[PDB]
Amino acid sequence: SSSALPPLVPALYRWKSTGSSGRQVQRRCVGAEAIVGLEEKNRRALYDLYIATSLRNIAPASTLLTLQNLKEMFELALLDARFEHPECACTVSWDDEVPAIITYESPESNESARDWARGCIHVQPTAKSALDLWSEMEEGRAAANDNTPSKSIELFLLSDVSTDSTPIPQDATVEILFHSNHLFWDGIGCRKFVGDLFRLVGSYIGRDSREMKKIQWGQEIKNLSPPVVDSLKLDINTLGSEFDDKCTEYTSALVANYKSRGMKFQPGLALPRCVIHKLSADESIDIVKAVKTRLGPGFTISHLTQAAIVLALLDHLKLSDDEVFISPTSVDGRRWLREDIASNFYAMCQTAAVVRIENLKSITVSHKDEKELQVRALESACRNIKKSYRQWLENPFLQALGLRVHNFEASYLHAKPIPFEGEANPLFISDGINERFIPHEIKQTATGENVLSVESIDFVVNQSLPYLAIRLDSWRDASTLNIIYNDANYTEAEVQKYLQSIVEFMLAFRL
Numbered sequence: 395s396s397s398a399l400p401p402l403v404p405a406l407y408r409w410k411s412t413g414s415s416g417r418q419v420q421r422r423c424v425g426a427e428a429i430v431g432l433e434e435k436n437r438r439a440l441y442d443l444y445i446a447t448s449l450r451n452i453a454p455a456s457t458l459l460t461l462q463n464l465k466e467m468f469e470l471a472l473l474d475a476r477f478e479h480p481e482c483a484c485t486v487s488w489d490d491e492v493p494a495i496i497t498y499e500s501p502e503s504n505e506s507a508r509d510w511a512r513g514c515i516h517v518q519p520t521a522k523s524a525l526d527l528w529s530e531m532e533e534g535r536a537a538a539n540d541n542t543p544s545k546s547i548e549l550f551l552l553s554d555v556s557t558d559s560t561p562i563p564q565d566a567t568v569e570i571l572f573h574s575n576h577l578f579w580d581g582i583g584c585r586k587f588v589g590d591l592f593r594l595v596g597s598y599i600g601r602d603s604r605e606m607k608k609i610q611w612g613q614e615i616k617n618l619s620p621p622v623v624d625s626l627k628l629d630i631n632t633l634g635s636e637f638d639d640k641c642t643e644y645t646s647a648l649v650a651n652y653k654s655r656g657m658k659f660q661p662g663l664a665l666p667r668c669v670i671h672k673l674s675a676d677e678s679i680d681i682v683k684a685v686k687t688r689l690g691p692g693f694t695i696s697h698l699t700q701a702a703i704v705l706a707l708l709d710h711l712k713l714s715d716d717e718v719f720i721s722p723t724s725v726d727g728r729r730w731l732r733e734d735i736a737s738n739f740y741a742m743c744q745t746a747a748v749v750r751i752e753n754l755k756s757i758t759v760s761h762k763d764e765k766e767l768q769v770r771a772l773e774s775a776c777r778n779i780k781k782s783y784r785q786w787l788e789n790p791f792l793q794a795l796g797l798r799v800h801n802f803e804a805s806y807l808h809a810k811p812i813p814f815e816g817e818a819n820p821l822f823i824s825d826g827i828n829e830r831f832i833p834h835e836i837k838q839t840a841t842g843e844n845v846l847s848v849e850s851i852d853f854v855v856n857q858s859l860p861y862l863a864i865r866l867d868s869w870r871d872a873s874t875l876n877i878i879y880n881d882a883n884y885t886e887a888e889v890q891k892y893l894q895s896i897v898e899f900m901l902a903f904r905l
């Protein structure tokens with residue numbers, strides 16, 4: 395009956411045994427899960443995660459690799475990974491409420507488990523890249539007429555050989571496309587799981603796997619990441635009017651951003667697309683250095699990228715004098731979890747801050763303006779950005795806030811599925827260094843010998859809403875930016891143009 399933002403709610407989100415054996419558990423999803431889990435969107439793969447890893451065969455000449463035996467090895471690794479992190483076999487259902495239900499069932503038998511793992515690993519002798527396959531799958535989705543949600547995870551192994559029993563040559567590449575329903579993970583969890591598989595598969599290269607100790611299915615249930623609410627350092631019962639007002643500030647900015655000036659888009663819905671700019675290690679190191687020197691401690695290339703996003707937008711437009719750039723921006727919420735949970739959490743764990751930049755005219759610069767003017771503008775924007783974040787990040791309730799406001803947003807989106815009209819303010823997503831989660835090599839564990847070099851990583855998300863989302867990460871000291879967009883709403887040329895503008899501004903910051 396009250397008009398107030400609904401409260402959390404913890405008991406609602408806990409794991410519940412659904413039958414007498416204890417083998418099946420379920421929970422009502424929470425926070426950002428409820429956004430990605432929105433039924434008509436999840437059924438159509440909105441926000442599905444794709445991780446494209448290009449790998450090179452650097453194994454001893456005496457190591458024999460084929461797509462068939464790699465499939466076999468990754469199946470074994472995936473069974474090990476399901477035991478460690480059962481998120482990879484959770485499934486989704488809905489009733490009449492907005493939030494999805496997440497279910498885990500322990501395999502009914504070891505045979506059943508192997509059928510499962512077999513069904514998640516695919517191969518193709520093909521010259522297509524991982525991201526060519528992504529495009530193929532998204533182009534196909536349409537006509538296929540099925541609104542089945544994606545599996546928690548599946549793998550596609552590609553290599554340009556004639557057949558699946560052709561030895562993969564020295565120095566040849568194997569591409570892996572990982573594909574995940576975003577419901578079961580965030581970008582941190584999914585990357586950590588990719589890293590786990592690259593670790594676990596190392597046990598199976600060069601070998602008698604049928605003789606290894608049987609997996610005692612059932613014993614992995616305790617391995618599911620615990621419910622996020624119950625995992626916070628903060629007792630959420632202790633919250634009062636400060637928490638309510640801050641949540642209100644967020645939901646107000648959310649609606650303000652949805653209704654605000656931004657990039658013009660054309661209405662419609664067609665295919666998810668991505669444009670990528672891989673900066674060199676040399677360029678990226680230079681930019682990181684220029685951030686350290688010019689701005690110093692507590693500033694990062696992520697702040698710089700957000701600043702460049704803003705400058706590129708202002709340079710693109712030909713805004714009211716009093717416009718404020720306001721942008722809800724997501725943050726990894728793990729620091730708000732208890733220490734012995736926080737570094738081993740695979741489920742969605744996200745919250746958010748509101749980036750605010752006033753005085754936009756004063757930072758409006760062209761690529762042709764004096765370098766020092768551009769640097770100044772970038773500096774001023776970075777300082778505004780860092781300051782904005784601090785106001786959210788310094789707050790001990792920030793993760794609880796994220797859960798509560800994303801519950802509201804799922805409900806808001808359920809009633810208004812496309813919340814932008816005419817224009818949409820670009821969104822920034824900051825992921826950090828992939829080395830935290832993924833190894834540079836897959837090694838034969840028994841020997842320590844390198845078998846496959848992990849040469850490239852590209853984190854691609856399905857976009858079916860009409861805003862640009864810009865994602866930054868890093869691998870082997872090279873920063874990568876990509877922009878996801880739906881091709882009903884924007885052209886490739888115009889998103890390429892905008893990404894190039896962003897990159898050009900960041901390059902301009904170098905010493």
Ligand SMILES: OC[C@H]1O[C@](CO)(O[C@H]2O[C@H](CO)[C@@H](O)[C@H](O)[C@H]2O)[C@@H](O)[C@@H]1O
Nearest residue numbers: 669670671672673674677890893894897
């Ligand atoms: O010249 C260094 C710089 O430019 C690169 C060269 O590889 O250019 C990339 O830019 C576009 C983005 O539109 C990519 O799609 C293209 O494949 C790349 O050549 C980039 O890596 C370096 O930063």
Ligand SMILES: CC(=O)O[C@@H]1C[C@]2(C)[C@@]3(CO)CCC(C)=C[C@H]3O[C@H]1[C@@]21CO1
Nearest residue numbers: 426429430722723724744745746855863
């Ligand atoms: C500003 C904010 O917090 O947004 C939310 C965080 C996020 C997890 C996600 C960021 O990772 C999903 C991927 C994309 C494209 C955009 C973002 O949209 C909302 C989300 C789905 O729940």
